[PDB]
């Protein structure tokens, strides 16, 4: 079957500019090329059909081209309803297939704000019943590049750990990650010295908050 | 002309010639004349080869 | 009739031997009644 | 208007049958092209799913081949999935979409329906394990918080702080599914810290399918 | 009095191939006296354990005959009988003046050498016979203690 | 000039396979003899390891025959070797160096390389813990400090005090391999006593594999 | 193989005198013998090859001799920059052997300095870790010869300490030493009174320093 590859798959850009999504497949297939809209949470939506009509209940700013194996979407004015993931479909002719594509993320540009750095220590009520886990926050951040490694005596730390990261707020526009390092209980006792690094572009130095119990 | 020789202990690319053992004949004897393997006692004729 | 190989604690040999009809069969011994 | 409605969540075990529905209204359903989609959590979905509501053929991907069978109904008009063989990586919600042509040619989707949340996988309990405020880690003039919740599977719930009264830092983490098998929660709040004490910081659990709700202060 | 019924119903045995006799048949036939072994290879040596297969292992370490009557159960012990910083706990012989007989002991700890005259530990020619396998727990499924 | 540069460290787990390499330049290398050798911490090195790079003849040792496996290339001039099933005594600086006459013949070391430092074990980090300057043990006029650091086994750092500011009493004690299987570093000073208090002094650590640097002051 | 043996193995005279290395073979060996030059943290470099010949760069104070099996190393002046271990390294002729040695240390000849005795009581910081050590310098010693012994309640100890030793000093031609004694937590608490036994050549005395905690 044909496989649609995506270089970009990303599109960081202000409400109001125009967009540059692509969707490029394998061979030389035809222009039966279709994207869609899905908005996180919501049900998907159609926005171009045959990469050369326009669809139902679509507004006149999403107006698609392409021809062959040269395809784009070229929005003409940004809404802030309209930053969602969309997604290609290539169909094929005799054997009734159909191919979808990865997605392009679309949100909103803001400056690169510094990272929050807190760090949340086990109480005792955990303690009690095993599995200790150190929380690290890290809220307020832009751009999604944040290296979260924790300082087991001044090293390195991964596998046992975690990172769960939010979607992006409609108020400030920030983004929120929280780490949890899964450990044991007659573990969390044998070190004293826990940290966490924090590497971001916007500081020019990674901060470590660590504390002692 | 002097030859020089490398002793190194690896697959060597030249070792001498292979010797071969003497005509045993007219005796029952294990044969290989290149592939052709058996048992025979060698003994000519007058035959005429090609 | 001491059995085995190589004396002089080399490798295992059997030594069968009868007592006051009693035949302990021990295979364990070596040579360093 | 065309709608399309589902049913709700679905746990099952990993080597049963699940049987998901997509009831279909407010159009004629005679001549339209019912296709089945699913999208799973990080991944994509890649099928084709088309099945004739009217005659009786079928219309299946390669990779799900005998492992998924469909089937419709022209009276109740609502097609029915049976996808047996369930593994460990088809906890994704479900989608039913309709075609924008009809039965003799083919488009892209128009209609989507709702989701069904299909999920395979065991159930436990939750349990609320508070963290600790440091008063170390203040600097910038605020606080910060947490009601870090234990290891529990089904999460059809909402976290929110004094019963919805603050409406400050209610940033929600998703979930991640664990070595052992389950989700674990995540929800802080950012507070000054002159409001240190005084005011009171209470998360509320609302675990439906446990019944048990626990509220443990900060 | 045998059953044979702890060996169907698990699963963890790697390689249950028996030679001669069948294993759903153990039940009703009786013996005489059987006689079990105990050996750990270097997982990659269950091959060789077999009535006409040959190697490092099978010819002067354990030889099996070639009208064998039995079955080979072997089974992985990468968390019971391995360390992280090392099992150097089993040694095999890999020098010996010809290959062993079926059912045959070779304990010996004297060095190795072409021709007689026995020699010293240290030497030019001369060899421990005897070498460890070196079990870990961080290697491929090749590399593993199995108990056969 | 003849010179021979050769990698950096190369930390490797009991049982994978090290590939060091070693290149030469400044010469024609078409024929040259080139040797391998590797110092052992307090031990001594004893093996051949004469590899041909022109033909594609080899030469180990006795205790290292299938273990070790070298190759060259007439193309880059840079041979390698593959030493497998690394052991725990092994762990030390290999050199290459070159031959004083050409193929044919045979004799001493003339050209070495600079160095290539493996490891075999597990990794780690250090902790700064400072010792205690007792009043007591004052006697001579002046005191002693110190800058113990905890069990690790990467050590590519080195210690000074005040940021260089101080050099009298700079003395490190290299490290040992403990029990445990990691390394344990020792530095202390020499100042006098009327210096007790007013003149700060603390260590300095640039561990940069680990990317921490903790000053602590005694 | 042909090994080397090499009696005296050290080496202690002062810069201006000649040097005495020796290195002897097993068998009675041709004259096919090469001496190194290996300056601790640098790189080894040659000496004298084939026992009969000088090498490139090397100066005129070095000249080697020996023959079939009484070999011999005879330095006209030394150097403070020649002040290193010595390897000789001996090779065989049909299997392209090559065998080396031990080494001999030449440590500068200095007059016997007394080793300052200092004990580093553990701080609070490692005790709440566990694992406390306690420290006892030795600096300051010319002759490499000091036995550190802890008293456990006017008893011995060994096993869990483990000694170091620097490298000879430029400036004053010194000595450092640090003794690390390895113990628990719960055992630390158990005894008070720890001492750390001095034994040198130039003292007179054992010097034994303890502390009351």
Same mark, same amino acid.
């Given at each position: 079957?044909?496989?649609?590859?995506?270089?970009?798959?990303?599109?960081?850009?202000?409400?109001?500019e125009?967009?540059?999504?692509?969707?490029?497949?394998?061979?030389?297939?035809?222009?039966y090329?279709?994207?869609?809209?899905?908005?996180?949470?919501?049900?998907?939506?159609?926005?171009?059909?045959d990469?050369?009509?326009?669809?139902?209940?679509?507004?006149?700013?999403?107006?698609?081209?392409?021809?062959?194996?040269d395809?784009?979407?070229?929005?003409?004015?940004?809404?802030?309803?309209?930053?969602?993931?969309?997604? %290609?479909?290539?169909?094929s002719?005799?054997?009734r297939?159909?191919?979808?594509?990865?997605?392009?993320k679309?949100?909103?540009?803001?400056?690169?704000?510094?990272?929050?750095?807190?760090?949340?220590?086990?109480?005792?009520?955990?303690?009690?019943?095993?599995?200790?886990?150190?929380? %690290?926050?890290l809220?307020?951040?832009?751009?999604?590049?944040?290296?979260?490694?924790?300082?087991?005596?001044?090293?390195?730390?991964?596998?046992?750990?975690?990172?769960?990261?939010?979607?992006?707020?409609?108020?400030?526009?920030?983004?929120?990650?929280?780490?949890?390092?899964?450990?044991?209980?007659?573990?969390?006792?044998?070190?004293?010295?826990?940290?966490?690094?924090?590497?971001?572009?916007?500081?020019?130095?990674?901060?470590?908050?660590?504390?002692?119990? | 002309?002097?030859?020089?020789?490398?002793?190194?202990?690896?697959?060597?690319?030249?070792?001498?010639?292979?010797?071969?053992?003497?005509?045993?004949?007219?005796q029952?004897?294990?044969?290989?004349?290149?592939?052709?393997?058996?048992?025979?006692?060698?003994?000519?004729?007058?035959?005429?080869?090609? | 009739?001491?059995?085995?190989?190589?004396?002089?604690?080399?490798?295992?040999s059997?030594?069968?031997?009868?007592?006051?009809?009693?035949v302990?069969?021990?295979?364990?011994?070596?040579?360093?009644? | 208007?065309?709608?399309?409605?589902?049913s709700?969540?679905? #746990?099952?075990?990993?080597?049963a049958?699940?049987?998901?529905?997509?009831k279909?209204?407010?159009?004629t359903?005679?001549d339209?092209?019912?296709?089945?989609?699913?999208?799973?959590?990080?991944?994509?979905?890649?099928?084709?799913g088309?099945?004739?509501p009217?005659? +009786?053929? #079928?219309?299946?991907?390669?990779k799900?081949?005998?492992?998924?069978?469909?089937?419709?109904?022209?009276?109740?008009? @609502?097609?029915?999935?049976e996808?047996?063989?369930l593994?460990?990586?088809?906890?994704?919600?479900?989608?039913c979409?309709?075609?924008?042509?009809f039965?003799?040619?083919?488009?892209s989707?128009?209609?989507? +329906?709702?989701?069904?949340? #299909?999920?395979?996988?065991?159930?436990?309990?939750?349990?609320?394990?508070?963290?600790?405020?440091?008063?170390?880690?203040?600097?910038?003039?605020?606080?910060?918080?947490?009601?870090?919740?234990?290891?529990?599977?089904?999460?059809?719930?909402?976290?929110?702080?004094?019963?919805?009264?603050?409406?400050?830092? #209610?940033? @929600?983490?998703?979930?991640?599914?664990?070595?052992?098998?389950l989700?674990?929660?995540?929800?802080?709040?950012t507070?000054?810290?002159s409001?240190?004490? @005084?005011?009171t910081?209470?998360?509320?659990?609302?675990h439906?399918?446990?019944?048990?709700?626990?509220?443990?202060?900060? | 009095?045998?059953?044979?019924?702890?060996?169907?119903?698990?699963?963890?045995?790697?390689?249950?191939?028996?030679?001669?006799?069948?294993?759903?048949?153990?039940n009703d036939?009786?013996?005489?006296?059987?006689?079990?072994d105990?050996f750990?290879?270097?997982?990659?040596?269950?091959?060789?354990?077999?009535?006409?297969?040959? $190697?490092?292992?099978?010819?002067?370490?354990?030889?099996?005959?070639?009208?064998?009557? $039995?079955?080979?159960?072997?089974?992985?012990?990468?968390?019971?009988?391995?360390?992280?910083?090392?099992?150097?706990?089993?040694?095999?012989?890999?020098?010996?003046?010809?290959?062993?007989?079926?059912?045959?002991?070779?304990?010996?700890?004297?060095?190795?050498?072409?021709?007689?005259?026995?020699?010293?530990?240290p030497?030019?020619?001369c060899?421990?016979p005897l070498?460890?396998?070196?079990?870990?727990?961080?290697?491929?499924? $090749?590399?593993?203690?199995?108990?056969?």
């Amino acid at each position: 079957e044909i496989v649609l590859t995506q270089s970009p798959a990303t599109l960081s850009l202000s409400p109001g500019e125009r967009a540059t999504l692509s969707c490029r497949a394998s061979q030389s297939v035809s222009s039966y090329l279709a994207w869609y809209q899905q908005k996180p949470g919501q049900a998907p939506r159609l926005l171009i059909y045959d990469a050369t009509n326009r669809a139902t209940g679509i507004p006149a700013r999403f107006s698609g081209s392409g021809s062959g194996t040269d395809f784009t979407l070229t929005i003409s004015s940004l809404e802030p309803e309209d930053f969602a993931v969309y997604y %290609c479909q290539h169909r094929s002719n005799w054997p009734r297939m159909f191919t979808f594509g990865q997605g392009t993320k679309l949100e909103i540009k803001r400056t690169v704000a510094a990272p929050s750095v807190f760090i949340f220590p086990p109480s005792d009520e955990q303690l009690k019943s095993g599995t200790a886990s150190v929380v %690290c926050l890290l809220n307020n951040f832009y751009p999604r590049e944040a290296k979260v490694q924790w300082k087991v005596d001044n090293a390195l730390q991964s596998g046992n750990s975690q990172e769960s990261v939010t979607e992006q707020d409609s108020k400030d526009s920030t983004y929120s990650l929280s780490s949890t390092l899964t450990l044991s209980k007659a573990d969390y006792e044998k070190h004293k010295v826990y940290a966490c690094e924090v590497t971001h572009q916007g500081l020019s130095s990674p901060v470590t908050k660590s504390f002692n119990r | 002309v002097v030859l020089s020789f490398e002793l190194l202990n690896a697959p060597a690319t030249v070792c001498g010639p292979k010797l071969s053992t003497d005509l045993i004949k007219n005796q029952c004897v294990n044969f290989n004349f290149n592939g052709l393997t058996g048992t025979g006692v060698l003994t000519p004729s007058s035959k005429r080869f090609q | 009739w001491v059995f085995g190989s190589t004396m002089n604690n080399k490798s295992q040999s059997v030594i069968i031997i009868n007592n006051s009809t009693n035949v302990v069969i021990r295979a364990c011994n070596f040579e360093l009644h | 208007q065309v709608q399309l409605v589902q049913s709700g969540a679905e #746990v099952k075990k990993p080597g049963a049958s699940v049987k998901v529905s997509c009831k279909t209204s407010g159009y004629t359903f005679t001549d339209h092209y019912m296709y089945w989609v699913r999208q799973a959590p990080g991944q994509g979905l890649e099928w084709m799913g088309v099945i004739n509501p009217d005659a +009786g053929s #079928v219309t299946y991907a390669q990779k799900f081949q005998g492992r998924v069978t469909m089937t419709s109904d022209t009276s109740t008009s @609502t097609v029915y999935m049976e996808l047996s063989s369930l593994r460990s990586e088809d906890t994704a919600v479900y989608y039913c979409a309709r075609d924008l042509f009809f039965i003799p040619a083919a488009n892209s989707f128009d209609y989507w +329906g709702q989701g069904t949340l #299909v999920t395979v996988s065991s159930t436990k309990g939750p349990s609320v394990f508070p963290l600790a405020p440091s008063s170390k880690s203040t600097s910038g003039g605020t606080a910060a918080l947490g009601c870090l919740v234990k290891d529990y599977f089904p999460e059809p719930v909402t976290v929110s702080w004094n019963s919805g009264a603050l409406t400050s830092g #209610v940033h @929600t983490f998703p979930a991640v599914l664990q070595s052992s098998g389950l989700y674990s929660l995540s929800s802080v709040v950012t507070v000054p810290s002159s409001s240190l004490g @005084t005011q009171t910081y209470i998360c509320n659990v609302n675990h439906k399918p446990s019944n048990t709700k626990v509220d443990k202060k900060v | 009095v045998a059953d044979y019924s702890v060996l169907y119903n698990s699963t963890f045995f790697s390689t249950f191939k028996c030679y001669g006799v069948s294993a759903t048949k153990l039940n009703d036939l009786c013996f005489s006296n059987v006689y079990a072994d105990s050996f750990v290879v270097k997982g990659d040596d269950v091959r060789q354990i077999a009535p006409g297969q040959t $190697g490092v292992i099978a010819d002067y370490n354990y030889k099996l005959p070639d009208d064998f009557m $039995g079955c080979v159960l072997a089974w992985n012990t990468r968390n019971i009988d391995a360390t992280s910083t090392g099992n150097y706990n089993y040694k095999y012989r890999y020098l010996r003046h010809g290959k062993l007989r079926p059912f045959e002991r070779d304990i010996s700890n004297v060095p190795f050498s072409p021709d007689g005259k026995p020699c010293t530990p240290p030497a030019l020619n001369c060899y421990w016979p005897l070498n460890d396998y070196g079990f870990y727990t961080t290697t491929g499924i $090749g590399y593993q203690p199995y108990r056969v």
